[PDB]
């Protein structure tokens, strides 16, 4: 059976109390889809009639930390189950508080210079995220009591852009985003 594909709409980073749909694309004619969450059965969809369906939607009306974590799906044709989809990380954001983002040496640098970002949030855990706007798949994770560092190394113009950081209350439960810091590389 083709491997199913799993994604979140509109996005996998969902503010608290906002909605998300988890989509699972299987195969036309598949008769049962399961959505798994962290090793448990979260929901089942049984397409009726199945011959017109290759994907199923699971709606979450009000996002919270108990529904944040890893999801996967599988589907069935006759007695045979597909292999699982890749894992979807569904993350709740805007939890509790707002961190401060800083940068060394500063926001304006020349190509070649080493840049470090710093994310501080005293009321959170030791795990922090650095997010370049536009590039959620390249989110960097850092570890530190009170604050974490994110060394970029020697930068080029590829590193130019707008950054925000998050503190975390668990792996999938993140703070409000920091105010943005623009990195200018000349």
């Amino acid at each position: 059976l083709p491997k199913p594909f799993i994604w979140a709409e509109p996005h996998f980073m969902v503010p608290k109390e906002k909605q998300v749909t988890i989509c699972c694309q299987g195969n036309y004619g598949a008769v049962e889809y399961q959505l798994h969450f962290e090793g448990s059965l979260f929901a089942v969809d049984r397409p009726k009639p199945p011959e017109r369906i290759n994907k199923v939607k699971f709606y979450i009306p009000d996002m919270n930390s108990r529904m944040a974590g890893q999801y996967s799906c599988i589907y069935r044709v006759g007695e045979l189950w597909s292999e699982p989809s890749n894992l979807l990380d569904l993350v709740v954001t805007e939890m509790y508080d707002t961190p401060t983002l800083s940068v060394h040496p500063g926001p304006e640098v020349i190509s070649g210079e080493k840049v470090t970002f710093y994310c501080r949030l005293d009321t959170a855990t030791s795990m922090f995220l650095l997010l370049k706007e536009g590039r959620s798949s390249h989110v960097q994770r850092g570890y530190g009591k009170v604050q974490a560092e994110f060394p970029l190394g020697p930068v080029t113009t590829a590193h130019r852009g707008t950054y925000r950081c998050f503190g975390s209350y668990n792996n999938h439960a993140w703070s409000f985003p920091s105010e943005p810091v623009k990195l200018l590389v000349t």
Partner: peptide, 15 residues
């Protein structure tokens, strides 16, 4: 009724 935080507009995930 689609909601999206401004910082996620044009994010690569939406594909």
């Amino acid at each position: 009724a689609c909601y999206x935080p401004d910082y996620l507009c044009x994010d690569e995930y939406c594909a």
